[PDB]
């Protein structure tokens, strides 16, 4: 009745999953149990397992065990390759569907790289830590985002607070500004600047944010319905190479914010 992997809880949220014996293969892990843990804990770091997922064919075949892949024009896999931070967002903003899971495989992460950790914000925890007056204000705010050339048109109008697709709580949908692109609704224009200051401070809080330093062959599973994610600005030059696959909910979740 024991698990077939070791688990350690991450601060402030998430699970770090590691092998029980040397050279344990990633294919040994029970995918349906992992999906349940990812929905409950929002972030899984699978570290130390043997895999050949830098092979695009093998990675795609592996991800199909998790569900329907959300395909992009370039295919199933985005190869993320290498100063400013990348703003918090959720994936699928400008697409017709929002994927439930992001899978990141680390094909390359030199110790040579300094900083630039991937950021993960548990918006369920943000909602749970808010006062009632805060949450009431946030539920009344909606935001229009304008982006780059995209395949499906490029304007997003999203409430700041949404109910989770599983109807078991509320989440935050927010795209932080980068250093009009963003336009806030239902708030006095006189208060927008300070609200933006205050809300970004709330998201970049040690109670809510986990910053991940990559190691080669990490497989990270992200609950895109519950989290926002981004990246710290890089101090040094980096050769990091991540490989990203999106997995649809069943049925796929249509993106009502796309305009
Ligand atoms: C569609 N879409 C994107 C969403 C996005 C929006 C803003 C930003 O800075 C980065 C990514 C994805 O899911 O990849
Ligand atoms: Mn992203």
Automatic annotation (TrEMBL):
One Pfam family named in its UniProt record: TauD
Keyword list, A-Z: Dioxygenase, Oxidoreductase
Domain of life: Bacteria
SUPFAM superfamilies membership: Clavaminate synthase-like
Alphabetical list of InterPro entries matching this protein: AlphaKG_dependent_hydroxylases (IPR050411), TauD-like_sf (IPR042098), TauD/TfdA-like (IPR003819)
Extent of the signal sequence: none
TauD/TfdA-like domain location: 9-245
GO molecular function: 2-oxoglutarate-dependent dioxygenase activity
Cofactor: Fe(2+)
Protein's UniProt keywords contain GTP-binding: no
Protein name per Swiss-Prot or TrEMBL: TauD/TfdA family dioxygenase
């Amino acid at each position: 009745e024991l698990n077939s992997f070791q688990t350690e809880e991450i601060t402030p949220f998430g699970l770090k999953i590691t092998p029980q014996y040397s050279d344990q293969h990633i294919d040994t892990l029970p995918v349906e149990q992992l999906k349940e843990l990812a929905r409950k804990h929002h972030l899984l770091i699978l570290r130390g397992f043997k895999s050949d997922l830098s092979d695009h064919e093998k990675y795609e075949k592996y991800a199909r065990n998790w569900g329907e892949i959300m395909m992009w024009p370039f295919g199933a896999i985005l190869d993320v390759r290498e100063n400013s931070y990348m703003p918090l967002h959720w994936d699928g903003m400008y697409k017709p569907t929002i994927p439930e899971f992001i899978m990141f495989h680390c094909a390359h992460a030199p110790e040579s790289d300094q900083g630039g950790r991937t950021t993960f914000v548990n918006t369920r925890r943000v909602v749970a830590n808010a006062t009632q007056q805060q949450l009431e204000q946030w539920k009344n705010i909606s935001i229009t985002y304008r982006i780059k050339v995209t395949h499906y048109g490029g304007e997003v109008h999203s409430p700041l607070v949404e109910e989770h697709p599983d109807r078991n709580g509320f989440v935050i949908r927010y795209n932080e500004p980068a250093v009009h692109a963003i336009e806030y609704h239902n708030i006095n224009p006189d208060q927008v600047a300070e609200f933006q200051q205050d809300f970004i401070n709330i998201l970049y809080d040690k109670r809510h944010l986990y910053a991940h330093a990559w190691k080669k062959s990490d497989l990270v599973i992200v609950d895109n319905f519950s989290l926002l994610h981004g990246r710290e600005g890089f101090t040094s030059k980096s050769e990091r190479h991540l490989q990203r696959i999106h997995i649809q909910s069943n049925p796929a979740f249509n993106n009502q914010a796309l305009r």
